[PDB]
Design a protein around this ligand. Sequence first.
Ligand SMILES: CSc1ccccc1CC(=O)N1CCC[C@H](CF)C1
Ligand SMILES: [Zn+2]
Length: 140
Amino acid sequence: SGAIYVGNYRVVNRHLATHNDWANLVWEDSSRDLLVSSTTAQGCDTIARCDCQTGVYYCSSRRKHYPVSFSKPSLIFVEASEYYPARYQSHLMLAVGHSEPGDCGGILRCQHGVVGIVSTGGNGLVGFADVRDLLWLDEE
Ligand SMILES: CSc1ccccc1CC(=O)N1CCC[C@H](CF)C1
Ligand SMILES: [Zn+2]
C-alpha cells in the first residue's frame, strides 16, 4: 500500500483505490494502474520533472529503501494476477529489486522528487508506474 500526496491530490495504484477514492475521483487509467482522488488537506510530496534513470524506492516487504537503476517509461507485458488480465501496461519502468503484491504503492524518488509508485515485479523485478508526465498534479 502507499500513495503520493501532492497539493490536493492523492495518487494511488488503481487496483488499491478505496470507495472514498472513487467517490472523490479526479482521473484514472487502467492501462497505467493509476488513480488520482482529491483531498481536503494539502500534501508534502513534490513531483520530479526529469529523465533520471537512477533513484531510490521503498520496499515494505523489507522495511528498506533500495537504490536502483530503472528503464525509461515504456509499454511492458505484465502477467496475469488477480488484479489484471494479460496485457501491456503503459508508462511502466522496470528495475532489479525484490518486490511482493503488497509492495505496490511504495515511492520511487530521484534527486528532483517523486518519480512514481511500485506497480509490478517478479523474481527480482519491480516495476514502477511513472507520474512525471502528469504535469497537472502541480496545479489547482
Ligand atoms: C510489486 S507487484 C509484484 C511483485 C512480485 C511478484 C508479483 C507482483 C504482482 C504484480 O505484478 N501485479 C499485481 C498487482 C497489479 C500489477 C499491474 F498489472 C501486477
Ligand atoms: Zn530526476
